[PDB]
Symmetry: C5
């Protein structure tokens, strides 16, 4: 694809960009941002039609970078190369509120903390994140305003190589439908952890001293095509339990801080 | 001198019908030791695929030839977010609550080798009556619940060797590298990591990776994620596919 | 920011500090605890007392003055290099007889457990904060500093909620987190664990050191000859005989080593 | 101890030995190898006489090495020196059988997996493993077919330095009576982990790529007396629960693969 | 103490020690256990028996004399360099039949579990302690050394509560922690886990060594040719058939290597 050349060093060679990404859990109304719509259980396989507000989606933001080429008709040009990232989950202490709309754990007791299944994930790339579709129930009837696997079949619950896509739209790709495709993503770095179980305790660390290096085995980081940097994220912290017993997913925003350098490439 | 091959391996949990791929049949309990006859669809089996590589020799009567040597592997579990579906055919944790997530006993395992994975048989109940269409330990005896060195086999057939019957044999497998973790308990939470930045090196303490005999590369896997609980309370194993990406180099060997 | 020069040699100094927790302290007899915690309150009518809300702890530590003339092109500042930090009184929770609730007939008291948050920071200036709310319509008490003009977006990103930890027992933990888009002159570390049955796990030692230098080899530079230490140590919930619960906190110790650095002025 | 001199390896200076060790959980009858007899509870401190089949014991095997044919009349001889070991627990997937004689977890549910307290342990030495006795109840009346601490007293529940022994017999030394003695065992390397709690989930890893080095701080591995090697093991995986509710310890076999070299010692 | 560079040689030595636990020992038949534990007691009327309170363990170990005259300007002291340490008798808890409570109909006995605390220290002098109390109004028995003049602040920081571990089986674990603002001549390590259902996790081996040298490359220097070892090993709670509970402890082994160090005086 791209012939990679020398890295420009010294002054006016580096740059930093930052970004706060909101979660996309569903947002049933205006007062419930950060949550999903009350969740439904025990739906029959052949009659499951979930609302969009019940389905958390991938978050994505494209970050525009400074144009580094005065002349786009040259043999050698330069591209921005992502070198490192600091990333952080925002508002973890908010869950120490056990009094607002909570269900008591017992008589005279405090409210039940947010807990259960979770998924924390982030990616950095010079292009949209490439996805592969996998379904728990291939007969699920997904709502309009969501991009899900087309022509879902028997094999969509295992390997169906037809379900390829890219994360090009925010709050559109349901988390439960898509995973990052390991057979692609040559120009993206991604990291995720899934934990399942309704009583699973969230464990969340914060610091400004942790850095992730984005260079590959060749010493090359993601190269930003069209002077665009893509950041993607999912941060399902668990389930919020209402006084009534109804539950909805909780999400939190995510921060990015990426350092890039100029690399020469062949045009 | 170098080359890459990749592979998606489907899980083999049982597949009771075309609408339930990835699942096992409904699991049975409390069966008598002397009368336990499981259906094949109730028994998850090892997955295996043989990958053909480019031919590199021309006269195998020569003293010195080239073989493909497996150097590194990237491997990944496919579809982990699928389990965030808590509405399809699930059982509610409580009145008004969401569905119960997949959980319980699990087993995640992969291997890379220049020949079929060598197995050793061990049985929980040596008197189990295993179905046709499966390869289980022959002439199972009292000692099959501990060490019975007669139960040797190789993983040469997909969806045939029941996971609960066989383990990789540590006294062999000189030409294979394998890795596995078992977790037991009905409430065990699955913990699954994904990334494209993790690489496993396949060279041994001598600096030699698996040498591919007959220009064949073998990949094996089991990925039992846990139990799916139906609304009625009945349960079935859940599995997910596994991806492989192996890098190989040409090596010189005796003949 | 500040352009740094060279380091004084052969020049050092150490400072230490015990920081009390600020869980709420409902009365003179219950230091280290919050007030009894409420549950199941209506989103549009939730008015928590101050004593129910644990707050960030902070202390500003004055350092020796090093300069005679601040018009000089080269000036010296104290540079924080390492810290040892420790949670004080972890064995106190082995008391299962004082005001406890028995786990069963004939059993011992229920140990402190549940959601926890352990956090510390070292910087040459106050810790910079970002506001995030679980419920943006919460009516916070007087005598506390919380996010101003809270809106719909205060439950996710609202970049208007910026603040600094300049006051002890004032900033509720549940309202603020350290701001990763700032804090260039501070190092912070924290872990949150959620769940009412979560077991506390707490290590103690005098052999663990944290290095405070950044990727450039520069530690926090202390502005106005001031060193700031901040902390939260919510260990979990204490369960009274009656079943009513209240947060438990413990003090935190700091031991910081600093060197003189020449700085451009 | 033994006086050793520097290392000098050549050709024909190495060798490997391997071994499968069966577990010794009790074996209540022929059909229940790898299990113990149903366990008792709530027994009185002063009248507690457990059956041998209820008590798991240490496993041990003496392994013969190639005779280096040294005449021990001279001050300088050769001994086998254990350098590395690969070790593995055999048959971990067997516990994925949840249908044979199990107790269901709930209506229409699968059988309850093996779980609870466990202990996994192995040792390699040039002589029998040296043991120290410690008892939970010093007044326990142990069955004749076991080696247990002699003249057990009040202090046998803490430190009683009289209870010294060696692991020289297989299926004789009850696990609950003995631990390896840290004040001895100069010529043995041992490793063990205990986990307590009736609902503890077993976690068991398998691989053929993990090696343990047996050299001490001086760079000397176990020196094998009389051209003999010793391997010891315990692998209590947890409790098996019958349909009725009775429980029995489960064990699994253990594999060893030891590499040795010839070493000069002072005789 | 000002140290000199390291010496060679007849320059080394090893000492070992088995330390019994001090859980309370309610009678001759119940060593390694505490007395049955009380619960739900009133804050203002809580008087624990000594046998209900586990205490720190401590031994002083005498070392070979090395100086003829302690008035000389250049002296030798023993310097602790490494330690191997081990918990003794972990398999004893595989006894689920002696005086146990069954988990269910037909089931085995309930294993020891719950809150635990495992801790050890090596130093050239007694371990220095800081007092912290869960309930400052607790009335401690006369066979114990506890914080004097306990006040409101004894539940957080009260810098008056300083002490040293100079007596075995006298300093209640729930009252004292090692003081991080001192202990320059001691190395300590501890972990607390809280929760009544917490599973004990205990590793044993003879291949693990801890190095006792500080960031300067100096280990504890044994004053008056004496070495101090301290320990706590609360494994959890033992549950009787009746449902009553008592702490369980196990002995701890030490093996320390020392070298002769030149020092100034």
């Amino acid at each position: 694809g791209i012939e990679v050349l020398g890295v420009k060093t010294g002054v006016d060679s580096f740059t930093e960009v930052e970004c706060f990404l909101n979660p996309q859990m569903g947002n049933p109304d205006e007062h419930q941002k950060g949550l999903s719509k009350s969740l439904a259980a025990e739906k029959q396989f052949t009659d499951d039609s979930p609302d969009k507000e019940q389905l958390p989606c991938y978050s994505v933001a494209r970050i525009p970078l400074p144009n580094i080429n005065e002349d786009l008709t040259c043999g050698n040009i330069l591209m921005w190369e992502a070198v490192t990232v600091k990333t952080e989950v925002i508002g973890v202490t908010a869950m120490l509120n056990l009094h607002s709309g909570t269900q008591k754990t017992h008589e005279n007791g405090a409210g039940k903390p947010i807990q259960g299944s979770n998924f924390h994930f982030f990616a950095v790339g010079g292009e949209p994140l490439e996805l592969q579709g996998v379904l728990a129930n291939y007969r699920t009837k997904y709502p309009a305003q969501t991009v899900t696997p087309k022509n879902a079949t028997v094999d969509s619950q295992q390997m169906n190589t037809d379900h390829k896509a890219v994360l090009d739209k925010d709050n559109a790709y349901p988390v439960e439908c898509w995973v990052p495709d390991p057979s692609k993503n040559e120009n993206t770095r991604y990291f995720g952890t899934y934990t399942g179980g309704e009583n699973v305790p969230p464990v969340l660390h914060i610091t400004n001293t942790a850095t992730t290096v984005l260079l590959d085995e060749q010493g090359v980081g993601p190269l930003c095509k069209a002077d665009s940097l893509y950041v993607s994220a999912v941060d399902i912290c668990g389930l919020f339990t209402n006084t009534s017993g109804t539950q909805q997913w909780k999400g939190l925003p995510r921060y990015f801080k990426i350092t890039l350098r100029k690399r020469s490439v062949k045009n």
